[PDB]
Design a protein around this ligand. Structure first.
Ligand code: NAG
Ligand code: XYP
Ligand code: XYP
Ligand code: XYP
Ligand code: CL
Ligand code: CL
Ligand code: CL
Ligand code: CL
Ligand code: CL
Ligand code: CL
Ligand code: CL
Ligand code: CL
Ligand code: CL
Ligand code: CL
Ligand code: CU
Length: 235
């Protein structure tokens, strides 16, 4: 159980974004149904009144939390990968529009899943804003907790992979559009019961064997990291 509080741009807190520039759900419950419209932007997908201004090459940092800001973030049991997608705002997230900007599953050197590192990062993970057309966008951050992913939700609705999905409204002002956005995948639709990384046993299969669900990261993407960029406690 986890939610987004807000974002930072180039290491500068943009402030509490909940129901303001984040299309926040009312609580931190996971989405499990792969076929639900809730896969798009969680259970309350609607236009919220602000959109965060950024330029290509900026560092955009999602900040997650559990019950309160900068707490334990997400329960340590919730081992799994983290991805970030982008789509044009005009889509409202419908159709084949989501382009993957970032993937992190398991780090062999440190022996840590993305979620494990997100905790250590005080909930913060970033992407570098790509050189797409100026305009309004949705950035869809997705955490997949795998602690009950040995079962499929479609077969046993009390278990299943757990999706913590947050959409941020982001406006890209300065960009040369030198890497125009390509074709994306649909949510719901891209992940099915047979997709790699949706059904997995984290307890008996070595984490080095895990493969995260496709699509693969777009070649136009400019990187990201799971790492603290700002200290929330100073505010
Ligand atoms: C999953 O979502 C689909 C599409 O909305 C829906 O028809 C189905 O009833 C859902 N499954 C459960 C178990 O609620
Ligand atoms: O559902 C519970 C949620 O309310 C809390 O925030 O995190 C622990 C969960 O069990
Ligand atoms: O399957 C179990 C899951 O529901 C909890 O975490 C421990 C697992 O054994
Ligand atoms: O011991 C593990 C249990 O806690 C969970 O489910 C899988 C088991 O291997
Ligand atoms: Cl929890
Ligand atoms: Cl604030
Ligand atoms: Cl669900
Ligand atoms: Cl605005
Ligand atoms: Cl809070
Ligand atoms: Cl860190
Ligand atoms: Cl749970
Ligand atoms: Cl540019
Ligand atoms: Cl579907
Ligand atoms: Cl980064
Ligand atoms: Cu949880």
């Amino acid at each position: 159980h986890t939610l987004v509080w807000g974002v930072w741009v180039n290491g500068v807190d943009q402030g509490d974004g909940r129901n303001i520039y984040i299309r926040s759900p009312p609580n931190n419950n996971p989405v499990k149904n792969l076929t639900s419209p809730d896969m798009t932007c969680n259970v309350d997908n609607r236009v919220v009144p602000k959109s965060v201004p950024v330029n290509a090459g900026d560092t955009l940092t999602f900040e997650w939390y559990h019950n309160t800001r900068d707490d334990d973030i997400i329960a340590s049991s919730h081992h799994g990968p983290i991805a970030v997608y982008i789509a044009p705002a005009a889509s409202n997230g419908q159709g084949n529009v989501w382009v993957k900007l970032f993937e992190d599953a398991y780090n062999v050197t440190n022996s840590t899943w993305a979620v494990d590192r997100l905790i250590t990062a005080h909930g913060q993970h970033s992407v570098v804003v790509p050189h797409v057309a100026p305009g309004d966008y949705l950035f869809r951050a997705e955490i997949i907790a795998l602690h009950e992913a040995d079962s499929l939700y479609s077969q046993n609705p009390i278990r299943g992979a757990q999706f913590y999905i947050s959409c941020a409204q982001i406006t890209i002002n300065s960009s040369d559009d030198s890497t125009p956005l390509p074709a994306g995948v649909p949510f719901p639709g891209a992940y099915t019961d047979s997709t790699p990384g949706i059904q997995f046993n984290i307890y008996t299969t070595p984490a080095t064997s895990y493969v995260a669900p496709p699509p693969s990261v777009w070649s136009g993407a400019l990187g990201g990291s799971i790492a603290q960029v700002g200290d929330a406690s100073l505010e």
